[PDB]
C-alpha cells in the first residue's frame, strides 16, 4: 500500500504518509475529465455520484466529503491506494526515458474509474478538446443526473443508464457531442438493453477485453485501450493517436505506420506495463 493510515475528521478523512501521490501528476495527466484545480490548489471533483474535494498537506492527503466507511470501500480503491507504485517505477526505468519520466511524473497513479461514465466520456473525447468534453459531460449529468451539493452550490452525478436511455440522438446533439451524438444513443441503448455487458466485458483478459469493447460504435482501438485502463484495470493498454504516433517515431524510431501498428510496436516495447509507460512518457513529453 501506497500510505501508512487513515484518521477520520468531522467532514473529511486524512490519508497519512503517502507515496507516489501528487495531485497534479493525478488529476491533469489527461486520465479524467470531471476533476479541476481551485484557485486555492485543491481539486474538486465529481465521482460514483459524490463531490469530492483533495488537498495534499506535506506527506498527506485530506479528502474532503467523505468518512472512514466512504474510504474503505470507494475512495482507497478509486486512488488505487493497494498498488505500489514504487514498484511500477523501478521496473520501467529499466527504460532510460521512462526513468527519466517517472522522476518527473513521481506523483501518477492509475485512478479506477466508473466503467459506464468512462465509457461514454471516452467516446465524446473522440478528436475532441477538453473544454469540449467537460461541457458535453455536464450537459447530460445536468440534465439526467442526480442533484447534488457541496458548500453551498450546486453539481450534478453521471446519469444512469436508465435516464440516459430516454434521450434520443438529437438530444446528445443539443448536449454538445456533435457527430458523436449517434454513437452515444447506440452505445447507450446498447449497454441499457445488456446487448453488450460491461461487467462482463471488464472481467476478462486484456486483449479479449479490447476486442469486446471495440464492437461499440464510437469506440476504436484508441477509446477502448482508454476505457480498459482507466476503467477496467487492463494495464498492457497503449492509446494511440496522431500525436502519440509522431512521439514515437521520433522518440523511439518507430516506422511510419498505422496506428494499429503504432499500438503494437509500444506494446511489444513496453511489455504488460505499457499503460503505465505511456502516462508517464506522455505526461513528460
Same mark, same amino acid.
Given at each position: 500500500?501506497?500510505? #501508512? !493510515?487513515? *484518521? *477520520?475528521?468531522?467532514?473529511?478523512? @486524512? /490519508?497519512?504518509?503517502?507515496?507516489?501521490?501528487?495531485?497534479?501528476?493525478?488529476?491533469?495527466?489527461?486520465?479524467?475529465? =470531471?476533476?479541476?484545480?481551485?484557485?486555492?490548489?485543491?481539486?474538486?471533483?465529481? %465521482?460514483? &455520484?459524490?463531490? /469530492?474535494?483533495?488537498?495534499? @498537506?506535506?506527506?498527506? /492527503?485530506?479528502?474532503?466529503?467523505?468518512?472512514?466507511? &466512504?474510504?474503505?470501500?470507494?475512495?482507497? &480503491?478509486?486512488? #488505487?491506494?493497494? =498498488? #505500489?507504485?514504487?514498484?511500477?517505477?523501478?521496473?520501467?526505468?529499466?527504460?532510460?526515458?521512462?526513468?527519466?519520466? /517517472? #522522476?518527473?511524473?513521481?506523483?501518477?497513479?492509475?485512478?479506477?474509474?466508473?466503467?459506464?461514465?468512462?465509457?461514454?466520456?471516452? @467516446?465524446?473525447?473522440?478528436?475532441?478538446?477538453?473544454? !469540449?468534453?467537460? $461541457?458535453?459531460?455536464?450537459?447530460?449529468?445536468?440534465?439526467?443526473?442526480?442533484?447534488?451539493?457541496?458548500?453551498?452550490?450546486?453539481?450534478? %452525478?453521471?446519469?444512469?443508464?436508465?435516464?440516459?436511455?430516454?434521450?434520443?440522438?438529437?438530444?446528445?446533439?443539443?448536449?454538445?457531442?456533435?457527430?458523436? %451524438?449517434?454513437?452515444?444513443?447506440?452505445?447507450?441503448? =446498447?449497454?441499457?438493453?445488456?446487448?453488450?455487458?460491461?461487467?462482463?466485458?471488464?472481467?476478462?483478459?486484456?486483449?479479449?477485453?479490447?476486442? &469486446?469493447?471495440?464492437?461499440?460504435?464510437?469506440?476504436?482501438?484508441?477509446?477502448?485501450?482508454? @476505457?480498459?485502463?482507466?476503467?477496467?484495470?487492463?494495464?498492457?493498454?497503449?492509446?494511440?493517436?496522431?500525436?502519440? $504516433?509522431? %512521439? !514515437?517515431?521520433?522518440?523511439?524510431?518507430?516506422?511510419?505506420?498505422?496506428?494499429?501498428?503504432? =499500438?503494437?510496436?509500444?506494446?511489444? $516495447?513496453?511489455?504488460?506495463?505499457?499503460?503505465?509507460?505511456?502516462?508517464?512518457?506522455?505526461?513528460?513529453?
Amino acid at each position: 500500500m501506497d500510505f #501508512d !493510515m487513515i *484518521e *477520520e475528521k468531522k467532514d473529511s478523512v @486524512i /490519508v497519512r504518509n503517502v507515496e507516489n501521490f501528487e495531485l497534479k501528476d493525478i488529476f491533469d495527466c489527461g486520465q479524467c475529465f =470531471r476533476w479541476h484545480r481551485q484557485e486555492n490548489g485543491n481539486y474538486i471533483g465529481i %465521482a460514483f &455520484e459524490k463531490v /469530492v474535494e483533495v488537498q495534499k @498537506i506535506g506527506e498527506d /492527503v485530506v479528502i474532503y466529503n467523505i468518512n472512514e466507511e &466512504e474510504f474503505k470501500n470507494v475512495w482507497s &480503491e478509486y486512488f #488505487d491506494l493497494y =498498488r #505500489d507504485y514504487g514498484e511500477i517505477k523501478k521496473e520501467l526505468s529499466r527504460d532510460p526515458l521512462l526513468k527519466k519520466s /517517472v #522522476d518527473f511524473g513521481e506523483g501518477i497513479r492509475i485512478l479506477r474509474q466508473d466503467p459506464f461514465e468512462i465509457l461514454l466520456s471516452f @467516446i465524446i473525447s473522440a478528436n475532441n478538446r477538453i473544454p !469540449m468534453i467537460k $461541457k458535453c459531460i455536464n450537459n447530460i449529468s445536468e440534465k439526467a443526473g442526480k442533484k447534488l451539493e457541496y458548500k453551498g452550490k450546486i453539481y450534478y %452525478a453521471f446519469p444512469t443508464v436508465d435516464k440516459l436511455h430516454e434521450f434520443t440522438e438529437k438530444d446528445f446533439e443539443e448536449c454538445t457531442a456533435g457527430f458523436r %451524438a449517434k454513437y452515444l444513443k447506440d452505445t447507450v441503448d =446498447r449497454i441499457y438493453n445488456g446487448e453488450l455487458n460491461l461487467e462482463y466485458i471488464k472481467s476478462l483478459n486484456d486483449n479479449e477485453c479490447h476486442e &469486446e469493447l471495440k464492437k461499440f460504435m464510437g469506440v476504436g482501438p484508441k477509446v477502448a485501450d482508454c @476505457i480498459m485502463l482507466f476503467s477496467m484495470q487492463k494495464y498492457s493498454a497503449f492509446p494511440v493517436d496522431t500525436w502519440v $504516433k509522431k %512521439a !514515437m517515431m521520433s522518440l523511439y524510431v518507430a516506422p511510419d505506420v498505422s496506428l494499429k501498428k503504432i =499500438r503494437d510496436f509500444g506494446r511489444e $516495447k513496453f511489455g504488460s506495463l505499457s499503460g503505465f509507460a505511456q502516462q508517464y512518457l506522455f505526461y513528460y513529453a
